Design a protein around this ligand. Sequence first.
Ligand SMILES: N[C@@H](CCC(=O)O)C(=O)O
Ligand SMILES: N[C@@H](CCC(=O)O)C(=O)O
Ligand SMILES: [Cl-]
Lengths: 250, 251
Amino acid sequence: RSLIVTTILEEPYVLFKKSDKPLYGNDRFEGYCIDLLRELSTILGFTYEIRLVEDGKYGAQDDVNGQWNGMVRELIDHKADLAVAPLAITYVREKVIDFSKPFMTLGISILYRKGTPIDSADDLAKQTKIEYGAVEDGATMTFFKKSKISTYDKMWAFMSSRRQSVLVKSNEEGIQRVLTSDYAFLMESTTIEFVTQRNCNLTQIGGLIDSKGYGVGTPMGSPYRKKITIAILQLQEEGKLHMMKEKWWR
Amino acid sequence: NRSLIVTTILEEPYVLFKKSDKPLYGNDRFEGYCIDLLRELSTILGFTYEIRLVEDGKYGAQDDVNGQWNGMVRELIDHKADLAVAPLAITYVREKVIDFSKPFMTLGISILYRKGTPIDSADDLAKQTKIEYGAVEDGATMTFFKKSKISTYDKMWAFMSSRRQSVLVKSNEEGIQRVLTSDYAFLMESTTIEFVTQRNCNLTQIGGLIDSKGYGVGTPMGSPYRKKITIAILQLQEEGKLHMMKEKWWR
Ligand SMILES: N[C@@H](CCC(=O)O)C(=O)O
Ligand SMILES: N[C@@H](CCC(=O)O)C(=O)O
Ligand SMILES: [Cl-]
């Protein structure tokens, strides 16, 4: 049977391929992650059907009901077999689902404009004229919400007392807020790298706040975890992953 | 509750003999980044352990003819150790015989060589033969070149393979020495080069990273510790401890 693969829209990992003619099925999709899934499928010999995550979320745990959502939720309830997307490997997520070894490594950092006085996270945390935030219900938000490091603690208190204002639905939404207002955006460095190759106005600020990877997500105990790990290491070793990265970051 | 058996290998600054005027015994003989990591893990997961240096002094590679493994990987396969806590690279071939925790450090193959030369990549090395070059025998680095379809890298393996017993060394320590005393460039892992170049201001990493990979804790395939150690490592990383460990030992 075909594998149900849940994913999410996120340039340049996953996007609607553009064409003069209507497109159908998996062929509607292109991107780094789309190329990766193809590769994985030819090495492992499986067929698959790509489905965008219904609630359009990556996956976080609700404070009250303690229930999950997004792509994470869909693996837990076995609605999908694989989650192929820029899905960050995190502590809280490993406790409910499995991940393959990372196909890409990265970290949280700051998207802002060039030539400003702001040069680190600490600079953002010690002022308030410059508003800042991040994708809601994402690994980045969760990092701050759970952090016990002073600066990040403070930054979360600020973001938390302004959920409606500074938190955004999507990366795209955040990027636009940076481009159109006086706003700094806490986001993942690989995605930042794509934004700055195309927005000469913008730049990463400071270094990486943490380190993490994107892995293929599976329901806990799935046979495909180990298998996809092996396929990913092959692709990496033979230089294909680096070629894919180059292709989609230009 | 039986302690775990932890296989490891000597490699600065991941693992080393603690310097002492008085003879040390058992676990007390060892210190380093990996030793620290091992202490963190044992507190989080609540286990005790016995440290054992892999007897053959090898990381682990498979023989072409017989299909048999050596080193720390052999120790895990044979179930002679419960964990491998070392700068052990997560690779395709190893992953088929053992399990790995999610990585505690990511890095890549690059080049260790002297300053003040016009050579800026592996392609520079690959086309000449005056400047000799090699890597650690039966390690993930030698294996990378041995298996690569990339023209430049295939060429470099032809060179290394033909000069096996004079350009391949038993350890990073050996390689570091050859670079320092001869016209020799050493293919090694970037994390280790970073340690070397800080200690030795006349050396430098030539070019960027030739590939990407991570170190992970090794377990026998199917071990229940794989998942738990993955979670512990992700904990240590997220709370900032792994970064502190790196600065502590890379000063
Ligand atoms: N890729 C992230 C979402 C983006 C972010 O949180 O910055 C995740 O897995 O949740
Ligand atoms: N750390 C390497 C050995 C050193 C090298 O090959 O450069 C390994 O896991 O095999
Ligand atoms: Cl794992």
